[PDB]
Amino acid sequence: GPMDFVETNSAVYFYGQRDRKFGFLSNFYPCEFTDTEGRRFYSSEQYFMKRKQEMFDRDNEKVAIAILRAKAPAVAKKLGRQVENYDDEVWAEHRYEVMLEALKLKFSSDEEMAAKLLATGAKRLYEASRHDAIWGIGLSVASVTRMFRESVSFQRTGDVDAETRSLCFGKNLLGNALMEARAWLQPQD
Ligand SMILES: Nc1ncnc2c1ncn2[C@@H]1O[C@H](COP(=O)(O)OP(=O)(O)OC[C@H]2O[C@H](O)[C@H](O)[C@@H]2O)[C@@H](O)[C@H]1O
């Protein structure tokens, strides 16, 4: 509903796989794709978590199987939080590009999903997750809605300004990765 996203002329603030319009931007959104080696994934979430286990605990049979079986994205996530030999410095260096790969597989798997991401044009994309300030901005959709309502200027440009983003928003690695996937999906002829 209207309380589940903010959309302006220049921005989309989304959260969650359920919204009928923007649900597809969520990494929990159900889909189906295969990697080159032929493993099957049912969300971008699950693939990202498999690549985390592969990076830190590659030979762990139980954990590899459990992630490949984790069709429920929240189960994949929790397994990902439990991956052993985790090194944050190393994951922080590599995790954006892993996510961008996940998104390339996901959006490549369905032309309708691809068309939906392209239909967002050049709008800036932000995951409005209150609890995730790495993949999202660490604010809820309601919080963002109050920022807009109290600012005639955000209302005029359709987005919060860069200084505000630098002080108020988390890293939004997902929104950034989606905008890079969207660029990658642009027609080349
Ligand atoms: N195995 C681990 N052991 C230790 N700490 C960990 C571990 N994994 C994560 N951390 C800690 O958790 C932090 C974040 O780890 P990242 O893997 O980037 O993300 P996410 O696990 O939040 O999953 C993000 C996905 O799930 C959401 O739906 C999003 O939208 C994405 O799709 C690290 O910096 C560590 O502090």
Residue numbers in the entry: -1 to 187
Paste lines from the article.
Modification of nucleic acids by ADP-ribosylation is catalyzed by various ADP-ribosyltransferases, including the DarT enzyme. The latter is part of the bacterial toxin-antitoxin (TA) system DarTG, which was shown to provide control of DNA replication and bacterial growth as well as protection against bacteriophages. Using structural and biochemical approaches, we show that DarT1-NADAR is a TA system for reversible ADP-ribosylation of guanosine bases. DarT1 evolved the ability to link ADP-ribose to the guanine amino group, which is specifically hydrolyzed by NADAR.
